[PDB]
Amino acid sequence: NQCTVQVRLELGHRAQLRKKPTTEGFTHDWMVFVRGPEQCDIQHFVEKVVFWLHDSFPKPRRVCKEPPYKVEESGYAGFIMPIEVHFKNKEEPRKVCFTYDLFLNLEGNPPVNHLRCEKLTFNNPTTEFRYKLLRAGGVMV
């Protein structure tokens, strides 16, 4: 049964100036996401993604149960965004948290377009979960 499976997640964000600062004077539009690499379907092993926005947002616990795993909002400032990626796994681990640095372009700088690549290593996953990771394009090591 000895077996290690690796899968890849990409977290990222885009930010630029709003032309029309909003009804609460929002200077930026931004978008944060979680995705797989090209030709991988992370929906096979990802139950859901939860984006924990700033406490100042309405309903700041944003849940994507299916792709795209993304939040699009307007704001005035960057903040640290907890992101939880829940797995379709019956044993441990059930999820992984990331602390995402959602930063905006200030002082009329070009738009932000950032990607953070994360490798997840699953040691001795169950038969069922191993199947999901490999279906998603996971690789045995």
Sites of contact with ligand GKN (CB under 6 A): 26, 54, 56-58, 74-77, 79
CA distances from 37 to 75, 90, 103, 141 (A): 28, 25, 23, 18
Residue whose CB is less far from ligand GKN, 101 or 118: 101
Longest alpha-carbon distance in the chain: 58
**CB of residue 116 to ligand GKN, shortest distance in Å:** 20
Cβ at position 31, least distance to ligand GKN in Å = 13
Q: Would you say 77 or 140 has its CB closer to ligand GKN?
A: 77
Strands 28-35 and 79-87: unpaired
Q: What minimum distance in Å lies between the beta carbon of 115 and ligand GKN? A: 22
In 1-141, alpha helices (H): 127-135
Residue (76 or 131) nearer to ligand GKN, CB: 76
